[PDB]
C-alpha atoms as a printed R data frame, in Angstrom:
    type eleno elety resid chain resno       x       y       z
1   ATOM     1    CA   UNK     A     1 101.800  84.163 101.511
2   ATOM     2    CA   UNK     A     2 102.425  87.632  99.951
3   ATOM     3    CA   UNK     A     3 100.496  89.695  97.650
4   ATOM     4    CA   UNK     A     4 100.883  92.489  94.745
5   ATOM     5    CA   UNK     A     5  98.073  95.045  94.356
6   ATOM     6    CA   UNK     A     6  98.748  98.138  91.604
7   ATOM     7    CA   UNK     A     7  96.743 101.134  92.965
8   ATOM     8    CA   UNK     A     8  95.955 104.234  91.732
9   ATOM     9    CA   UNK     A     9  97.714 106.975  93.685
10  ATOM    10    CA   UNK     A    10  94.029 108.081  94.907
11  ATOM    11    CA   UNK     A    11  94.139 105.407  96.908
12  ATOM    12    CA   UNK     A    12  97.437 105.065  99.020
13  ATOM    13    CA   UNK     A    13  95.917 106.048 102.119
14  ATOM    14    CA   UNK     A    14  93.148 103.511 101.892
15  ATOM    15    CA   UNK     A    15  94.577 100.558 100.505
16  ATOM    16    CA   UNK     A    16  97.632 101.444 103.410
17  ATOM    17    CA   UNK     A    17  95.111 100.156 106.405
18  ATOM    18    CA   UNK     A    18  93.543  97.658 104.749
19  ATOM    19    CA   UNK     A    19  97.003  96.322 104.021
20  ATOM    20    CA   UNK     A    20  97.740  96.820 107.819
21  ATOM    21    CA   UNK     A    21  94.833  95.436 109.214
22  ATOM    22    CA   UNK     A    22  94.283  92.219 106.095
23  ATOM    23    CA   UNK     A    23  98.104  91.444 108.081
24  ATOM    24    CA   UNK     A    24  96.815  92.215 111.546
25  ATOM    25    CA   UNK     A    25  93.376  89.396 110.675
26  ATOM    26    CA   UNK     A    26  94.904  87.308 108.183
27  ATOM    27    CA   UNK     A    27  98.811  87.273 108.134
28  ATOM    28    CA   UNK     A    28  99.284  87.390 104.508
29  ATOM    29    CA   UNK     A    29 101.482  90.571 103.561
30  ATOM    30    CA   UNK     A    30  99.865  92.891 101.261
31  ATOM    31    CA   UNK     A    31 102.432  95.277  99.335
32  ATOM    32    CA   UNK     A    32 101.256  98.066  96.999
33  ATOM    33    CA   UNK     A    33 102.694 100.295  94.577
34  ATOM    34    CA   UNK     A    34 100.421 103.694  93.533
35  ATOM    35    CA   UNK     A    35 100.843 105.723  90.401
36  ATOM    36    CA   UNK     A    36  98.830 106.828  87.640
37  ATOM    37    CA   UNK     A    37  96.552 103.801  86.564
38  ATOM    38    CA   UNK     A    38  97.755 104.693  83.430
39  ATOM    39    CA   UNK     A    39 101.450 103.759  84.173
40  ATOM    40    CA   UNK     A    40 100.608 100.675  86.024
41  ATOM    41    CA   UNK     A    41  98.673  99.764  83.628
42  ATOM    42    CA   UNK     A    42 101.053  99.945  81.438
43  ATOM    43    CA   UNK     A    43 103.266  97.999  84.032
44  ATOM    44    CA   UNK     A    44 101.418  95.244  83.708
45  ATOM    45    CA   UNK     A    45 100.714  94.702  79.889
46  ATOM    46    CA   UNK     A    46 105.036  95.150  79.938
47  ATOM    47    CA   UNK     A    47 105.127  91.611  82.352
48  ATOM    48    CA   UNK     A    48 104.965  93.367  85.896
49  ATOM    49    CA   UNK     A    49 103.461  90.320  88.131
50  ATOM    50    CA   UNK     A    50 101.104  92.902  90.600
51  ATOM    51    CA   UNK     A    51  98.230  90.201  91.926
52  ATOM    52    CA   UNK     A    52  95.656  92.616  91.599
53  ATOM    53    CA   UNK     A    53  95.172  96.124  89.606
54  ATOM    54    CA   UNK     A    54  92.837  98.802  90.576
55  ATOM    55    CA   UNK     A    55  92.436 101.731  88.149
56  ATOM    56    CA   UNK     A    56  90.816 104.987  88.597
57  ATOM    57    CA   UNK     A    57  88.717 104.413  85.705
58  ATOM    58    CA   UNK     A    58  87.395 102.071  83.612
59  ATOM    59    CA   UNK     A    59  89.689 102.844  80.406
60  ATOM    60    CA   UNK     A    60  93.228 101.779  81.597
61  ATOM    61    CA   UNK     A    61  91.467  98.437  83.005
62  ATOM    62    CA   UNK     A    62  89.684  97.712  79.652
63  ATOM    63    CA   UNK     A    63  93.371  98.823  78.069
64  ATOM    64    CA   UNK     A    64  95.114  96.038  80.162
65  ATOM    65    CA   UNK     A    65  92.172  93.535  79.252
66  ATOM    66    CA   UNK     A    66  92.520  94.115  75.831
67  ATOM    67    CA   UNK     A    67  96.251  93.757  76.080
68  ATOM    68    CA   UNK     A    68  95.381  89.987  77.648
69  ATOM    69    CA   UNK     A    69  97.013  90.796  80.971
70  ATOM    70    CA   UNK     A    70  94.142  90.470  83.166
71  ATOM    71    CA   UNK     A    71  91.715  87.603  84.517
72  ATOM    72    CA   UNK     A    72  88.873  89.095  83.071
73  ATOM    73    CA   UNK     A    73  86.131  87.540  84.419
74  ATOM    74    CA   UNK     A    74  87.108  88.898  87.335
75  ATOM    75    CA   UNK     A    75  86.469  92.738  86.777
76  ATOM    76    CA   UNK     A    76  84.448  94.486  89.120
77  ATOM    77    CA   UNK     A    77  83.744  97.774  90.229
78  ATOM    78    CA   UNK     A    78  84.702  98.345  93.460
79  ATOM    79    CA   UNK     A    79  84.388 102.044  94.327
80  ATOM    80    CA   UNK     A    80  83.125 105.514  93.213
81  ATOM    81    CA   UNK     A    81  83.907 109.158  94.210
82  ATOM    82    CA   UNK     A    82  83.365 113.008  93.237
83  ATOM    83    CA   UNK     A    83  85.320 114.849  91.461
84  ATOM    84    CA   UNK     A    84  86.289 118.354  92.951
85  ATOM    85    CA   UNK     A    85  88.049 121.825  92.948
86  ATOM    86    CA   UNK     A    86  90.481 121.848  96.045
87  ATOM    87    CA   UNK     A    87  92.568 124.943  97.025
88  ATOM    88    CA   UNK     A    88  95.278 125.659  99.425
89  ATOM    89    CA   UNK     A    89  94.286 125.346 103.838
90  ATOM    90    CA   UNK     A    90  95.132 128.944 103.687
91  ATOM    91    CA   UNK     A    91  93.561 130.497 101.013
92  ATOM    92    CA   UNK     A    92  90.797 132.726 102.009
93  ATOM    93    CA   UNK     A    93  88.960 131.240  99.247
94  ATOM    94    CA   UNK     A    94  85.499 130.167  99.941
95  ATOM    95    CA   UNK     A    95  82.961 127.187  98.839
96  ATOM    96    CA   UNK     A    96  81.078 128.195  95.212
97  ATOM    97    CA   UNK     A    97  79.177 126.095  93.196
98  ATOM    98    CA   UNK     A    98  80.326 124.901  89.298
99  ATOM    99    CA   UNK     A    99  78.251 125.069  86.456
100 ATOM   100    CA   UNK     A   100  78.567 126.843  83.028
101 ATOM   101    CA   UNK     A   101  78.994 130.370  84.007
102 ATOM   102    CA   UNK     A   102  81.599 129.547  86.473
103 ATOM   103    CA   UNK     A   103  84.455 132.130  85.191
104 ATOM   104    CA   UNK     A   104  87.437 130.325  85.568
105 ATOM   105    CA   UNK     A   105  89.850 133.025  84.808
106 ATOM   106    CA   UNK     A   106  88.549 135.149  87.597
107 ATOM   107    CA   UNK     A   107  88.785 132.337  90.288
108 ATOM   108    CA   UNK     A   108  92.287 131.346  88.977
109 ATOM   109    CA   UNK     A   109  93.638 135.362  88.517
110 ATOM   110    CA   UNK     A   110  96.585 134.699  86.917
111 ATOM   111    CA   UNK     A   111  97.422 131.388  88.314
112 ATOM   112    CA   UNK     A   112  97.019 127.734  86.780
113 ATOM   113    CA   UNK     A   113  94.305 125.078  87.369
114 ATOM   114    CA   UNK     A   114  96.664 121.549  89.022
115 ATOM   115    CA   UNK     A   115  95.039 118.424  86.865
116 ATOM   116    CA   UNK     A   116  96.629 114.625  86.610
117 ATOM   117    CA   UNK     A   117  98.146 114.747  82.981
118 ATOM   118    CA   UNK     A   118  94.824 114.932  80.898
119 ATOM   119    CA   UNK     A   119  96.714 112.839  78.316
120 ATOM   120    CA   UNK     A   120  96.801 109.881  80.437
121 ATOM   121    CA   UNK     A   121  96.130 110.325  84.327
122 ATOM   122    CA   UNK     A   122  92.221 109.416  84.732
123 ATOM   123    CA   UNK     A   123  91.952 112.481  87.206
124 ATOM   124    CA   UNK     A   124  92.997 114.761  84.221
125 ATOM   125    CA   UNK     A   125  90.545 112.289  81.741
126 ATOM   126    CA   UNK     A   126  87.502 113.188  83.948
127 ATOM   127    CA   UNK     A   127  88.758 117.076  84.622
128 ATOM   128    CA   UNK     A   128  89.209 117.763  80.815
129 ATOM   129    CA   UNK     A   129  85.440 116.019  80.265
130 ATOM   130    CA   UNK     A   130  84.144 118.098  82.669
131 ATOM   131    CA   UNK     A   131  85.611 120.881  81.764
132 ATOM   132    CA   UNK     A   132  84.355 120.633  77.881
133 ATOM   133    CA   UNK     A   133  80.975 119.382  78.544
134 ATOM   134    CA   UNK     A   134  81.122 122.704  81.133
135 ATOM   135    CA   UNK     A   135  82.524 124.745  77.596
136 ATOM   136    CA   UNK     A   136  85.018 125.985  79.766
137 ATOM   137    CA   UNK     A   137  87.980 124.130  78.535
138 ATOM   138    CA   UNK     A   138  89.771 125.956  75.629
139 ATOM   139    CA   UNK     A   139  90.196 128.816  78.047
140 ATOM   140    CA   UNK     A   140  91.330 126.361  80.486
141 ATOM   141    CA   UNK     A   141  93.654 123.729  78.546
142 ATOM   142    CA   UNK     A   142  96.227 126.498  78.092
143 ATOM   143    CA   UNK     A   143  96.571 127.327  81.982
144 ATOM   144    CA   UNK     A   144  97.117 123.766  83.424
145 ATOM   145    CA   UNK     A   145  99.270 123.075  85.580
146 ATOM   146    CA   UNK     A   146  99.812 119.186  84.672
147 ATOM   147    CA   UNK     A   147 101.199 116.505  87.578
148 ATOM   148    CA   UNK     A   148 102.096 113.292  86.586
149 ATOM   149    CA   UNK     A   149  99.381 111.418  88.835
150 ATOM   150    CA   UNK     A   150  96.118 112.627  90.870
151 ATOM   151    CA   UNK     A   151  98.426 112.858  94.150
152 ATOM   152    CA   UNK     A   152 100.918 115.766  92.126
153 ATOM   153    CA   UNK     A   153  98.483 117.507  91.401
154 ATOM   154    CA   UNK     A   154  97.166 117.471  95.104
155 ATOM   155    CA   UNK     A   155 101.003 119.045  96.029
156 ATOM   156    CA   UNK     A   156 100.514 121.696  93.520
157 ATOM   157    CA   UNK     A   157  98.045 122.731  95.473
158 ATOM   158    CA   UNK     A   158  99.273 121.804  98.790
159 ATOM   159    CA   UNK     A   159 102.236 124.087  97.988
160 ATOM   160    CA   UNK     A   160 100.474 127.207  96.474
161 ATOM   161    CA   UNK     A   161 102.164 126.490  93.042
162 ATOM   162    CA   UNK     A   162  98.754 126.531  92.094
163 ATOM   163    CA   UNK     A   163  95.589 128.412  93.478
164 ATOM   164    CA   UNK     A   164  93.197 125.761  92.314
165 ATOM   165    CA   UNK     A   165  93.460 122.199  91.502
166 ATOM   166    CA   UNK     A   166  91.179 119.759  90.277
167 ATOM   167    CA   UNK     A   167  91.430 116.322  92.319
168 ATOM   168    CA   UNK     A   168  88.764 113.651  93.792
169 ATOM   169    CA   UNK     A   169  86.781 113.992  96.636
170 ATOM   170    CA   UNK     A   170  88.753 111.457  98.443
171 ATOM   171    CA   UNK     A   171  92.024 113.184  98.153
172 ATOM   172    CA   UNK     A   172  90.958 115.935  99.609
173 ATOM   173    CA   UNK     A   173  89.909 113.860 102.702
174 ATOM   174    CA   UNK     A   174  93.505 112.676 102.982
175 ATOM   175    CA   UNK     A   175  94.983 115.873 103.114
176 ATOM   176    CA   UNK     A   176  95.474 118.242 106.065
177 ATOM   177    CA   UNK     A   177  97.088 121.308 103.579
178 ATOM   178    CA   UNK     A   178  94.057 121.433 100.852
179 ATOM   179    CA   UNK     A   179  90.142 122.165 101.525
180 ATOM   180    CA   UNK     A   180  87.325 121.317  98.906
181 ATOM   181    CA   UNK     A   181  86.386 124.617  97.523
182 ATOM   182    CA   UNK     A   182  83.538 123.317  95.038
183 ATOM   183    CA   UNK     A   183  82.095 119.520  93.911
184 ATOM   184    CA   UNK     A   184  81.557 118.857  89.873
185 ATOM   185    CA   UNK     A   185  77.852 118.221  89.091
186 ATOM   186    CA   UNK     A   186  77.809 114.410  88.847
187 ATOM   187    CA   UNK     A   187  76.076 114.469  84.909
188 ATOM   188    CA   UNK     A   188  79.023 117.210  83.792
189 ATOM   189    CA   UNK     A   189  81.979 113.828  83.281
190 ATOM   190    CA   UNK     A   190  81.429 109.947  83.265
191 ATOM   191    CA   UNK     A   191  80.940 108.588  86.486
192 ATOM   192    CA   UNK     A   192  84.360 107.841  88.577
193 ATOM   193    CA   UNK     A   193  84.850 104.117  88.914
194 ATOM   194    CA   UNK     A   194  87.071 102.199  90.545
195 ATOM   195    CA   UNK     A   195  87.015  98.613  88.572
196 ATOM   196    CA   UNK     A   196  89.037  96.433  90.473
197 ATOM   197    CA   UNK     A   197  90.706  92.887  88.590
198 ATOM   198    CA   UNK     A   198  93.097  89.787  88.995
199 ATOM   199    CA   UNK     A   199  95.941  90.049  87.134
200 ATOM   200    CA   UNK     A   200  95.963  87.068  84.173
201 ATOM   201    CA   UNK     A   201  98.132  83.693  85.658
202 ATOM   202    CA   UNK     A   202  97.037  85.237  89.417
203 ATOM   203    CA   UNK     A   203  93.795  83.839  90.091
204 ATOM   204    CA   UNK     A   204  95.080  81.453  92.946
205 ATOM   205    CA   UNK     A   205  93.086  81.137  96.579
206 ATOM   206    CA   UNK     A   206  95.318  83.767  98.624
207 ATOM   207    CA   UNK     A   207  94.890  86.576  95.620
208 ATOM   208    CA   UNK     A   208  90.934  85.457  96.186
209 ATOM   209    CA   UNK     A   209  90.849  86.085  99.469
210 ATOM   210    CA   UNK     A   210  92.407  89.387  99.310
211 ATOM   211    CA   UNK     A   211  90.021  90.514  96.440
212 ATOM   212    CA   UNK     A   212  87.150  89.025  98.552
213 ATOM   213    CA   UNK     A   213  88.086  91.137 101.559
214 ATOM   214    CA   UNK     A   214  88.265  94.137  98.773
215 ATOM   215    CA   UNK     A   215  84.349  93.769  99.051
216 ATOM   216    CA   UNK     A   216  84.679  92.950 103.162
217 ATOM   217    CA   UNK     A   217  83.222  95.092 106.008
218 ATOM   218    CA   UNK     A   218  86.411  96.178 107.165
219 ATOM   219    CA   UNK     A   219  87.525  97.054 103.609
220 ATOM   220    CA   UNK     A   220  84.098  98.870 103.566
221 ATOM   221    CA   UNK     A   221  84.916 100.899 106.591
222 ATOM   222    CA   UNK     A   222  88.142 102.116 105.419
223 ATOM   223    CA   UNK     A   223  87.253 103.055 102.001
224 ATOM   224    CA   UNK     A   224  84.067 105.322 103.518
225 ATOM   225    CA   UNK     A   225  86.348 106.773 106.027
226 ATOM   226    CA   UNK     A   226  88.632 108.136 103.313
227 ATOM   227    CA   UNK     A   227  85.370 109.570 101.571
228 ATOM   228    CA   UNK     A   228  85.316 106.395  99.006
229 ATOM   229    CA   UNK     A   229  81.504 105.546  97.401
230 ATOM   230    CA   UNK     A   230  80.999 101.646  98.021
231 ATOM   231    CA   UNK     A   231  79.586  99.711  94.981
């Protein structure tokens, strides 16, 4: 009894515990593997056999559905969260709020803004969204400083490659070296989703009970306590 889940990276510390615990209550081995959702995505349409897939937004799940490697019917969405400007535990920094007379330039003085690829990396999807519907992004799109996944740009920051980053709300939670310097308005990007699907040819009773405990109040719990929005 052993099961697959692709994660984004957002989630490693969350999906960790549950894993722990879902062993702890139910002795079936959970085993995860974060990136981009874009690249496991990807993973999957190319044959990977992951039990379950949970993106960071809705576009690399409705890429792998219209690819035929998931069990559509099951899509849900499972969680939310904020999007957010993080900078280093030791800047002297302080809390602003965004809108569109946030100057960028002057907050970043010389540095670059850390974003999840905005080619592929949801993170970077919602940040470059913002950022336009803000009318702040052709200053910005030449200063990025772009990670391959949500949790590289987090290091950026972490490190002080970068004065400013733009990450979710949750992985700011899960990180001792980064505070949340400033939350995006909720109408400025799309609304972060978590949909959460059964991989096509997966859809057996231990994958269900797994994806039911997804939805469970221990799940629930978890999810919250690493600053996740239940659905």
């Amino acid at each position: 009894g052993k099961i697959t889940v692709f994660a984004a990276c957002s989630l490693t510390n969350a999906m960790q515990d549950i894993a722990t615990q879902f062993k702890k209550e139910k002795g079936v081995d959970v085993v995860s593997s974060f990136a981009s959702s874009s690249t496991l995505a990807r993973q999957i349409e190319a044959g990977a056999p992951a039990d379950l897939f949970i993106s960071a937004d809705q576009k690399w799940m409705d890429y792998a559905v219209d690819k035929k490697a998931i069990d559509t019917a099951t899509r849900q969405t499972l969680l939310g969260n904020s999007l957010v400007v993080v900078a280093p535990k030791a800047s002297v920094q302080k809390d602003f709020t965004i809108d569109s007379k946030t100057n960028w330039t002057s907050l970043l003085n010389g540095g670059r803004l850390a974003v999840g690829d905005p080619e592929h990396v949801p993170a970077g999807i919602y940040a470059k969204e913002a950022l336009q519907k803000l009318g702040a992004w052709d200053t910005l799109s030449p200063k990025l400083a772009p990670a391959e996944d949500v949790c590289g740009a987090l290091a950026l920051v972490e490190r002080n490659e970068a004065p400013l980053g733009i990450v979710y709300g949750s992985d700011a939670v899960a990180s001792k070296g980064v505070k949340v310097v400033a939350t995006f308005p909720e109408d400025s990007h799309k609304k972060v989703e978590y949909p959460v699907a059964v991989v096509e040819g997966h859809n057996n009773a231990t994958v269900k009970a797994f994806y039911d405990y997804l939805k469970g109040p221990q799940a629930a719990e978890i999810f919250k306590r690493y600053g996740f929005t239940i659905k």
